[PDB]
Design a protein around this ligand. Structure first.
Ligand SMILES: [Ca+2]
Length: 294
DNA sequence: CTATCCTCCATTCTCAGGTGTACCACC
DNA sequence: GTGGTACACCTGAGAATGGAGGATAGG
């Protein structure tokens, strides 16, 4: 599978994690060991992607049981990381707030690169980085380093290439199918199609840009947190804007299968074969086997 | 000592799957 | 006053987030 670059970058922007890890091993010089990882974790169904991803990075890292149903691709070697992973994400930049995480990550590996992690001044610096990464410094660690100061998250700020969006959407996107109980329809149910991209409110500026990017969409915000939902319910737009896009820039992973069954429904709908009881049944079967289950 | 390998979590973050009802069609 | 559609709102399971120790292989 080709799996061009931009789809990868996007897919990571959505699902990827860069971790900098600091652990006390009194067997060291600064009573602390500093590890750096690049991890992707996915369901059993999407194992083929990880292997295609491993391949993509010239067979680097390892794939291994992570959760009860999940598996993890990881490059934990700093030589390897600095050799293959960085030169990539320098050339093909992330555009999400991840870019900030990676950027810090990059600095930690350069420090490691010069052996300045094995020193004291290097450690304090490296901790200042981690402090600005992910959820951030954590419990045990903070209490060990208080006189400290998290490093400023960088000035991040544009969708570089369509395929980014294909990949990105494969990670955090959603091709919903709804069966609504209507009281004013011959068959008792309204058939609906919804395309949905979920994300944290940090990336509000990017999310707003999609609307302009796809010429359609009505982003909104969760009621109970800083979660945004770029959404498309307008069937005519689904028909003429969403489908023809992802048809040309194909979804990578298990989701693609959904997108297909989704399209299948959208035909049953375009033909109006959704207001028949037969058409309804044809849709249910589709509904019931796609996304959840199958 | 230093770096990479390996086998395990727990809690939040996205997914996914509903509505309510305004406005549209119709004529 | 029928037969249909699209926002705007609502609410939860359970995997992704982002970790956690080890035990080693390279010194
Ligand atoms: Ca994600």
């Amino acid at each position: 599978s080709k799996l061009n670059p931009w789809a990868v970058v996007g897919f990571i922007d959505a699902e990827g994690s860069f971790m900098v890890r600091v652990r006390k091993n009194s067997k060291y010089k600064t009573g602390w060991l500093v590890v750096a990882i690049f991890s992707v974790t996915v369901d059993k169904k999407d194992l083929f992607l990880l292997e295609s991803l491993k391949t993509f990075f010239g067979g680097l890292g390892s794939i291994k049981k992570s959760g009860n149903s999940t598996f993890s691709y990881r490059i934990e070697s700093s030589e390897q990381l600095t050799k293959i992973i960085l030169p990539f994400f320098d050339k093909y930049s992330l555009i999400t707030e991840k870019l900030g995480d990676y950027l810090l990550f990059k600095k930690v590996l350069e420090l490691m690169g010069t052996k300045e992690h094995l020193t004291q001044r290097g450690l304090e610096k490296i901790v200042s980085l981690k402090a600005s990464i992910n959820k951030g410094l954590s419990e045990e660690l903070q209490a060990a380093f208080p006189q400290c100061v998290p490093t400023p998250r960088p000035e991040i700020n544009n969708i570089p290439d369509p395929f980014w969006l294909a990949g990105f959407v494969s990670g955090d996107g959603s091709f919903k199918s709804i069966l609504k109980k209507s009281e004013s329809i011959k068959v008792g149910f309204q058939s609906i199609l919804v395309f949905q991209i979920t994300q944290h409110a940090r990336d509000v500026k990017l999310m707003e840009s999609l609307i302009s990017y796809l010429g359609c969409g009505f982003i909104e915000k969760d009621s109970r947190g800083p979660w945004l939902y770029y959404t498309v319910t307008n069937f005519s737009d689904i028909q003429g804007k969403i489908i023809p896009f992802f048809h040309q820039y194909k979804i990578i992973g298990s989701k693609y299968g959904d997108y297909q069954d989704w399209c299948k429904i959208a035909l049953i709908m375009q033909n109006k074969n959704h207001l028949t009881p037969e058409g309804l049944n044809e849709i249910r079967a589709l509904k019931g086997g796609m996304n959840k289950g199958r």
